[PDB]
Amino acid sequence: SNRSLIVTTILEEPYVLFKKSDKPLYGNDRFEGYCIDLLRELSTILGFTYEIRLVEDGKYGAQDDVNGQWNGMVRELIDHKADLAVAPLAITYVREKVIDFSKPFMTLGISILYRKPNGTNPGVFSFLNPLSPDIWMYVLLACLGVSCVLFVIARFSPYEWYNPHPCNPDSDVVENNFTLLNSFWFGVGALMQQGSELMPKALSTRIVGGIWWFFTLIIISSYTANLAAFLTVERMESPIDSADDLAKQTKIEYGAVEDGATMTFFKKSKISTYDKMWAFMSSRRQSVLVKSNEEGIQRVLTSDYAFLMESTTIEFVTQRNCNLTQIGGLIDSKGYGVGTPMGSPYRDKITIAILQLQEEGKLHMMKEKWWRGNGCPEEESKEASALGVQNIGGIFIVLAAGLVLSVFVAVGEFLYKSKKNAQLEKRSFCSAMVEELRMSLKCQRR
Amino acid sequence: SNRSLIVTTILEEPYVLFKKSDKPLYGNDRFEGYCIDLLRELSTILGFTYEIRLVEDGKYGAQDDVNGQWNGMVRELIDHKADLAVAPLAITYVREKVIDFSKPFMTLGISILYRKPNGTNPGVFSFLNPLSPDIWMYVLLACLGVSCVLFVIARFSPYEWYNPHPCNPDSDVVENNFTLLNSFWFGVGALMQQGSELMPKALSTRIVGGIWWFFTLIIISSYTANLAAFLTVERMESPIDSADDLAKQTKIEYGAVEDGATMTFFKKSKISTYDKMWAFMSSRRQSVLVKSNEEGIQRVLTSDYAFLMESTTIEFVTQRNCNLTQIGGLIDSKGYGVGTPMGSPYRDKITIAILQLQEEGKLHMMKEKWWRGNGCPEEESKEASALGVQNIGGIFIVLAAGLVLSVFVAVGEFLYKSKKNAQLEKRSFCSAMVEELRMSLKCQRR
Amino acid sequence: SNRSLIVTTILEEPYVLFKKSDKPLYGNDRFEGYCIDLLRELSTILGFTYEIRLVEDGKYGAQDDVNGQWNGMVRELIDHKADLAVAPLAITYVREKVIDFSKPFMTLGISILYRKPNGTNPGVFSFLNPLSPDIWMYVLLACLGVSCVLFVIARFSPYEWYNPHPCNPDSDVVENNFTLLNSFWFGVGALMQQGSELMPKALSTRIVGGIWWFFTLIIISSYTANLAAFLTVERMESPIDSADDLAKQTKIEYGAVEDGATMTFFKKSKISTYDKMWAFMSSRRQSVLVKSNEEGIQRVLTSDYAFLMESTTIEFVTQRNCNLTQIGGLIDSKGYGVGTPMGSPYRDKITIAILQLQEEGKLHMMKEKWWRGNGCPEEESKEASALGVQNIGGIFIVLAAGLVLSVFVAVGEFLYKSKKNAQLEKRSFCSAMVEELRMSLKCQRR
Amino acid sequence: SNRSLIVTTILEEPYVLFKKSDKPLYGNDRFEGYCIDLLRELSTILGFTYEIRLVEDGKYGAQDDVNGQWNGMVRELIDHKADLAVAPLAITYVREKVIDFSKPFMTLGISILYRKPNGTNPGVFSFLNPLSPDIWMYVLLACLGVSCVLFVIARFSPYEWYNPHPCNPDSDVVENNFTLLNSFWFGVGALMQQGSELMPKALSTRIVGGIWWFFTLIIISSYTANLAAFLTVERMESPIDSADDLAKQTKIEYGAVEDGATMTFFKKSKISTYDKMWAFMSSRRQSVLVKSNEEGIQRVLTSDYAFLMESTTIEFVTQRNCNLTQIGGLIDSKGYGVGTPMGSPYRDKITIAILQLQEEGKLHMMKEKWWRGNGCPEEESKEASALGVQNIGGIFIVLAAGLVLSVFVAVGEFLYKSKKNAQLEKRSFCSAMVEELRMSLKCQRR
Ligand SMILES: CCCCCCCC/C=C/CCCCCCCC(=O)O[C@@H](COC(=O)CCCCCCCCCCCCCCC)COP(=O)([O-])OCC[N+](C)(C)C
Ligand SMILES: CCCCCCCC/C=C/CCCCCCCC(=O)O[C@@H](COC(=O)CCCCCCCCCCCCCCC)COP(=O)([O-])OCC[N+](C)(C)C
Ligand SMILES: CC(C)CCC[C@@H](C)[C@H]1CC[C@H]2[C@@H]3CC=C4C[C@@H](O)CC[C@]4(C)[C@H]3CC[C@]12C
Ligand SMILES: CC(C)CCC[C@@H](C)[C@H]1CC[C@H]2[C@@H]3CC=C4C[C@@H](O)CC[C@]4(C)[C@H]3CC[C@]12C
Ligand SMILES: CC(C)CCC[C@@H](C)[C@H]1CC[C@H]2[C@@H]3CC=C4C[C@@H](O)CC[C@]4(C)[C@H]3CC[C@]12C
Ligand SMILES: O=S1(=O)NCN(C2CC2)c2ccc(F)cc21
Ligand SMILES: O=S1(=O)NCN(C2CC2)c2ccc(F)cc21
Ligand SMILES: O=S1(=O)NCN(C2CC2)c2ccc(F)cc21
Ligand SMILES: O=S1(=O)NCN(C2CC2)c2ccc(F)cc21
Ligand SMILES: [Cl-]
Ligand SMILES: [Cl-]
Ligand code: NA
Ligand code: NA
Ligand code: NA
Ligand code: NA
Ligand code: NA
Ligand code: NA
């Protein structure tokens, strides 16, 4: 039982944080978190003691690049003012050349924050979803096709040519109701579950009308049934799915903390996907390169934005907030190791100790204690809302579109009729004045 | 004949209870309850007289860790001051080392107390729900709009003025069926999937009719599919029926008595479901860990609070408050036994006595006597799966409101025609008197 | 460390059973189960040793009623041939008077086996489910009611009386299409989404027809939406729910093992529900009173039958087989205690030991190890089957019923018309021969 | 310059591999793979020559409990026969006590190997599914039946023979519209929710029509509601995506290698999800615990088997077999490191070397080189939510089969009328030649 060990440590949530209680200045009980619970079972396997001491700089450690000076915790490991450095101190090439790390107690990497998909604006259309766009086109080609065959069959069939005007029998007038215009109007009216004023006689034409009724009944029942499936089981999806899916889109925008461990990866990279991801950030600096992790979560949360930080911080924030999600897998591969002065014998002993608690399964149990939050999967048979102008509303567009198209056809009917009346009258403006007065008579006859 | 026995009890209810009556100075006639009826029947078959005596405190028994000594009824037993403890004194491992219980006379455990679900109150006019209130107004404005467009287009188009009376050909009259009243009746009849007796013949009016048919096909398929979603997700709504169903939720919060036997179970627990239940309550142990059972029941009423207590008190308060119910089975499993000093020659004679009263069904009849009180107006018609008068309901109100409105219009048609009839021949009223006559003819003449 | 303890034990699953392996005659390792794992942690808390020995009778123990002789395990406890009796040996009044039991390690009682509900025959009807039977009656009273008002409004309105035969204008004929027969035919045809040949003019009657179309559209959309809820979420239920629900029905039938611990409860009972349950079994002996537990499970499984055994055996069988379920709660209240000779000091030591393992939570962990099976909740979004003659099929009944009713009305139309033709002809059999030839002309005219 | 270093490896792939080539007698040019590329790049920056040497056995290393000594590559290190072990030698707590690893060059864990879902093959004519094949036949027999009943009832009823040509009143002709062809056309048009041009007028035929309207209202509402159920439950079908999703199931069975590092994890586990996974596999440890990784992959193909192995081999075989996939993330967390004797002056120089190759991205480029092979034809269009040509499909076949059938009937109508036309005036063919002429008139005349 020698003298106590000085454990240098920075404050990070959920790694090391102050306890929320009264009666201040506990002393060695002022702290809790993951690294405090990790230190407790290191003091059970090995034998040593505390005076957990915070770093007087609030930094991890880096290179001054002119002085040759080290900062943060690792400056307190070079000059022997501390003994251990149980903290999120990542194992790096430039750090291992000046201190010693144990084997990792936590793996991590670079991943993506993005706002969780919501299903608030599916489109002012997308009542049109439950049938594929091939099916919406194939029912026009069926409706145009059946209407053309119904015109041909009705002219070719003898039993469709009947005697009109049964008031006066024994005449020599013979009519056919199926014109070309009336044959489209049968197929459109049957398709809309409405029925037209004319109905096929002459059994060859009733098989056409009868098989088009069975086609129509299945199509509309399949539209209603698949729409009820969409409105009951809401299955949402994200625009982006990986890093290369973010490497192509320009609408969603990138982002990382400036002068951090994540920005240095994309600067030094040579992968063609990750080289494109840095040509963005080198151009659009002061607009995507945030200066802290706490600020960059807000720009995901407010703006339309995707943020690049470490994966253990994503796994902590996305348990607290339910607006947020993780996109894709991992990009880098790093580890958190217990710092140690160079040449110290405590490196190989903690390496034994971490591997013991890993086989027992206690590092998994510590992490589940400090990273699980409320969780919010919400496990709910998706709460049905009233259907509104953000769900349907394209039918209000195509209704007003078809009522504008009908005014143009009404003028084209008015000019073509007035051209034929002017064939027995003056040039063009006589019959334009003759016909427009008749509607201004405001009477039922003539 | 020997000395009478001194028995300690404790003022919990229904166990012992001051008898609400006048005329004081009783002996042990002050007391009544379950444990008084049990001590009466144990006396008649073992042959002893007894003197009931409340303990000092209102404490069952616990070991003060500082003093190392016990308090309450287990202190009266261990000091040989009393020799029976007929009370809700739970058989515990720490209590069995200092006194001797008999075999149990009552079996219990930990269960969850929660408010009975108030219901739905579906809000007759609940059929109006699958669409937004703006959607019901926009469809009502679209039907008035299309009917005003169809009136103008069919008026100005020359191809709608056909020849009426085709039974007399080669006459010279033209008639437009699309009046103002007939244009609303096209749009109403197309909206309701029915079909009016009049059909568009020009191409300009077959665009208005054809695009209004596609509008109503989407609206009615959207109403049916979304109403299917509302009715499917509420059959998937299952109420909470387990402690594990409380584990996944954070909306309904837990609660227990601080420093009780129920709270002690969740600390020592190693079940992962019950560990999450303590990971909840250890975080919020200023709001949810209530002081007493009386305060915990009041919070189940005036909150969304779920309370954890023993099963015998849940089975007592839910017989006397039909707002409350019991969710789930039993979590723990313990029992009540009478208390004796260690080495007493009565832990075996009472075990014979309790087993004799269990074969004869007297323990069951004593529990029905004191735990059932004033049977509930419960009336479980909760299964409620079919649509009923409380569900649709209001489609009969708007029906009967429409039948009354049409009678006032039929009076207006009867008076406006008769006033025009009395404009030419009659004066005011004898035209109306003879018009009631022709309508009273029992045939299709006049 | 004295001599070894002789533990007498019977074979029961999942209590004590032979291990399934080769290399026979292990010796003290030939057994496993619940009671073997219970003995293992009794030998950890206390200190003793085995020679687990089976009973040479295969019984528990009872009274010979003439010899005064005891059988089973408890005969080996009276005569000191064994030391402990770790087995399902229930604590009974007649057993405690001759041996000693510890405190219970397992609670149990009497409950009910019954076959799990299936949803195979919902009825040849019960397409009629999604609306309540009040709603099915209120739409007849609406259809009969609207048809009566439509008859009254159309006769009272002037604008419904129109001029027929537009071939010949300027006439003095005035017709009304709304008879009493035609007014029911409008309301029936509108209700079935079909439309009749006549349509209301005269705005007061169009409000009647327009508000009946909106009534019809909501009713049929609500039928289709609630039927889709029933076919998606299959929520089954049982005929019986408790013991008193079995105390009234005569279709499902009772049953218990003859001359067992469960039959003796219903014989000795005095509760009015349980007294009725024995008047059945005393009458219908050799038909419901089975003679083993293994046979009585088959009669639940094959016949229509409800079986009364112990609840721990129900909780074991219903995890193995998925056809079976448990009905209601518990009826009796018993316990399994470790047997012990009278006056032995090992009773109070095991009582300490069982209460220690209960506070640690190990009896719950042993029971979950030996009673959980596959479980089969099946957790499946209920597999939709094709709809068949066991689901619908009542519509095939009411179709054939209405086609038989229509033949009776066709004769009643034929006799009433032939009565009116015979008013201008002979008595009754002239016009019966006149009319029947006209249909045998097989021609379109006359 | 010093002695060359002796490095032990082991024949696993992609790690070391005999180079498939002719011309034997190589040195260490026999070998290629990931660990050969790693040992090459560690040599160029640490400056040493090396001789590769397979170990003796094909064993990594394990401690025989009888002998107390090690075997395999860890035996070559502990006896100082070799001094490098560049191999998949996982860093283990028991291995770290006898040798010295470097920091990891590869991170891995336990994951689940399972066959990629083959799909649906919906079976075009899949719209025919919500009703039984007997139901589709009984509706087809009911439509033929009601149409034969309606023909007989409307013939024999006197109230159907109305007066045709009402435009000429007081004539003496009667006509029945219900012919045989018109009676099928009523029943087909009522079945398809359309409306034929003919309506029943007698009460006997309005019972046939009114009960056939109620039949088709239930049939079509049953088709739509049951098709909504089929399409809703398959959107609730989610594939297995976790180890916990395997825990609830017994249909898909587990599997691992007996006496491996993966099997050892589930024995020592205290997670309740993983304990059920071992409670499965310890029961069935003759079928599912397979001998090798090669036999376990073959059982994933030709069974419903899910296999538990390390992540690097799952990521290798799923790049070369698109029938296979990886479910879930990682369960364990371990790593591969090079092996040194205890106290060797190379565990630190290689840790510098591996961290240098990780900053320069060379470890990532070496893993892409040997784990990606011949990129998959994957083509994930699995989202497949809308109904498409593979879903309905066959309603276009039965449409086009009905359009072809009607052309053969129109030829039969053209020949039967002309043969009756050539019965009176013409002989055989010149009646048919002039009938093609009148149908070729571009107007409604002849
Ligand atoms: C059961 C019914 C039977 C009756 C059928 C009757 C015929 C019906 C014919 C339907 C034909 C339509 C085929 C288009 C399908 C592709 C969808 C699309 O890309 O939309 C996109 C383009 O946004 C748009 O412009 C909407 C698509 C065209 C609408 C304009 C014509 C209205 C169609 C009706 C004509 C009315 C008149 C016809 C009748 C008189 C917007 O969709 P989104 O979701 O917001 O964005 C994601 C797009 N994505 C999902 C593809 C990725
Ligand atoms: C969207 C629709 C709009 C159109 C509406 C049109 C009017 C429709 C009028 C419907 C009126 C029917 C009301 C009965 C409701 C009670 C159910 C019942 O008890 O059934 C039981 C009795 O078994 C039977 O006999 C069936 C009930 C009567 C059927 C015979 C008349 C046919 C009804 C149609 C008339 C056709 C002619 C009318 C049209 C020309 C069997 O049901 P179960 O499930 O097997 O057993 C459990 C019973 N339980 C669930 C109650 C516990
Ligand atoms: C493309 C737009 C702008 C103009 C199209 C003009 C079309 C729709 C017009 C011009 C000529 C018209 C036809 C002229 C004559 C007749 C005969 C009559 O008994 C029925 C209507 C019918 C058959 C018309 C139908 C509509 C018609 C074909
Ligand atoms: C109850 C069954 C057995 C017999 C009922 C007889 C009923 C349905 C019959 C007998 C008299 C019949 C009416 C006699 C005359 C006419 C006038 C005609 O222009 C339309 C049909 C109509 C209005 C008939 C409708 C049907 C009718 C009312
Ligand atoms: C195409 C082959 C296989 C079938 C036989 C030809 C069919 C289509 C023909 C042959 C006899 C024909 C019928 C003969 C007489 C009449 C009466 C007339 O007022 C209406 C048409 C009607 C009812 C015909 C309909 C068509 C008909 C049924
Ligand atoms: O800094 S390390 O000890 N060595 C380098 N790497 C590797 C990429 C394999 C990793 C990967 C994951 C870690 F947790 C640690 C390390
Ligand atoms: O205090 S006891 O006599 N022994 C412990 N238990 C057990 C559940 C085993 C129970 C369970 C219910 C009781 F009523 C008594 C007891
Ligand atoms: O045989 S016992 O020890 N004493 C009698 N009873 C009771 C009815 C309370 C019970 C109830 C449950 C048990 F587990 C044991 C017993
Ligand atoms: O053998 S290690 O160096 N130390 C233990 N673990 C840990 C998960 C903490 C891991 C995890 C991944 C590795 F690559 C190495 C190791
Ligand atoms: Cl006892
Ligand atoms: Cl190391
Ligand atoms: Na170092
Ligand atoms: Na005791
Ligand atoms: Na006894
Ligand atoms: Na080591
Ligand atoms: Na539906
Ligand atoms: Na649904």
Numbering used by the authors:
A (entry chain B), B (entry chain A), C (entry chain D), D (entry chain C): 429 to 874
Question: How do the authors describe this structure?
Answer:
Kainate receptors (KARs) are a subtype of ionotropic glutamate receptor (iGluR) channels, a superfamily of ligand-gated ion channels which mediate the majority of excitatory neurotransmission in the central nervous system. Kainate receptors (KARs) are tetrameric ion channels that belong to the family of ionotropic glutamate receptors (iGluRs). Four TMDs form a cation-selective ion channel, composed of the M1, M3, and M4 transmembrane helices and a re-entrant M2-loop between M1 and M3. We find that blockers reside inside the GluK2 ion channel pore, intracellular to the closed M3 helix bundle-crossing gate, with their hydrophobic heads filling the central cavity and positively charged polyamine tails spanning the selectivity filter.
The intermediate affinity blockers, PhTx-74 and KukoA, showed hook currents of intermediate amplitude. For NpTx-8 and PhTx-74, the extracellular end of the density had a bulky cap, which likely represents averaged conformations of the blockers hydrophobic head, while its intracellular region included four prongs, likely representing four different orientations of the positively charged polyamine tail. The bulky hydrophobic heads of NpTx-8 and PhTx-74 occupy the central cavity, while their polyamine tails stretch nearly the entire length of the selectivity filter. Based on the four-pronged cryo-EM densities corresponding to NpTx-8 and PhTx-74, the polyamine tails of these blockers do not align with the pore axis but instead lean towards the selectivity filter walls adopting one of four nearly identical positions in the pseudo-4-fold symmetrical ion channel. Compared to the starting pose in the cryo-EM model, PhTx-74 dramatically changed its pose during the MD simulations to maximize its interactions with the channel pore and formed several hydrogen bonds and hydrophobic interactions with the residues lining the central cavity. The resulting pose formed contacts across the channel pore. At the same time, water molecules were excluded from the central cavity. The tail of the blocker formed hydrogen bonds with the backbone carbonyls of Q621 and Q622, which were not present in the cryo-EM structural model. Overall, PhTx-74 formed fewer interactions with the channel pore than NpTx-8, explaining its somewhat weaker potency and stronger discrepancy with the cryo-EM model. This example of discrepancy between cryo-EM and MD results illustrates limitations of both methodologies and inherent differences in conditions, including temperature and averaging due to local symmetry.
